[PDB]
Amino acid sequence: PNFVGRDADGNVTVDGRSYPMAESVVATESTIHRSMKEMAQTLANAYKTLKHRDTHNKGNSALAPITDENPLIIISVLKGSYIFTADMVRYLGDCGLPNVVDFIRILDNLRFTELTGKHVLIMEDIADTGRTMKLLVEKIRREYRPASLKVCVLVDKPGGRVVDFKPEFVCLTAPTRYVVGYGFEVNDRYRNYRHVFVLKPEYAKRYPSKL
């Protein structure tokens, strides 16, 4: 239960802390985690009874269920999705969905090599124009041809989509503005904030120097 207000200077405050960069709040921490917990229940319901090719015992030719021996493959997209993935896989643990996480950069390579015929779920933190995920779903499809490939996003910005891509799973929806907080950044700043805000346009270019 977070309390959103304004300080004496007119800056947005969440639970008494001032966020001078924020214009408004998109979702407080309680809203974000309430969404991810229901999302984990949704994913678990969508994947628990499924079957895919057994990479555990290479000698078995029948298709195996999703267990700790043949878990769900989760591809987290660096950089901003690591906080989202961290909370998410623990929620999937609560719903008892066995899973494994490998990371990719948008480019640093995957290290998993047994994706063919496997159920695969990519976890990105935002879809805006839809380009980044359209290229990623096409690349993974042709390099590995999994059994299923689906996208779960923390934040969908539908109003700014240019290509035609939809995430199968969406935690939050956001307005067509630049957001920061909880993985979203401005030159890596505000990534560790526990809520998602709309950034003041005056702050969009405040840290131009390269890290």
Added chain:
Amino acid sequence: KPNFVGRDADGNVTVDGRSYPMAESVVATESTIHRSMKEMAQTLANAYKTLKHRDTHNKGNSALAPITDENPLIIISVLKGSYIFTADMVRYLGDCGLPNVVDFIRINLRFTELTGKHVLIMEDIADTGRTMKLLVEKIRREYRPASLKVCVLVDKPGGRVVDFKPEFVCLTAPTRYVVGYGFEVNDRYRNYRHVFVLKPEYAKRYPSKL
């Protein structure tokens, strides 16, 4: 708040009613781990609050600059196991008001302006110490930072056979193989909210390749 630890009808470890058949014992529950990290967030905040390092945000200011949103503390997390530890930790550092940024290394960085900066490595385990001794020596050589300290989630000082000691330690464990909360056996059990001693029978349970 505190997690309840017991045993089920078959002697398996239970935490809050959920059974963990691969576990031998519980090193630390989620609440113990989070109380520790929250106290480390205070400790790190007191250590870096008043420091100063090179001003890269305004390269025309030859004077040193405090740790701000313009020149934050550089934090290097190592992948993969330490990403969950890092995710919780940076948020705790947010509550303690310590401005920081995180880039990841695996054993490739993308940050390059580390010289004259305060840098802190986030790792989940220090046992023999070889992996961390190699990293600090290589970063001091290729970056010449102002300071370079190490914060680890679990320290196993009975296992060290090489000269290295982390300046910041959340938990101290015996010389045993742990799984849970970042720690794994062939990428399993990473997402469990607690840290368990692994049964030696489960050590070679998933030999196949991912």
